[PDB]
Amino acid sequence: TGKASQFFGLM
């Protein structure tokens, strides 16, 4: 789930 790290920055 490393690729889903940038998603956290969107929030």
UniProtKB/Swiss-Prot annotation:
PTM annotation (Methionine amide): residues: M11
Record's protein name: Endokinin-A/B
Lineage of the species this protein comes from: Eukaryota, Metazoa, Chordata, Craniata, Vertebrata
Gene name for this UniProt entry: TAC4
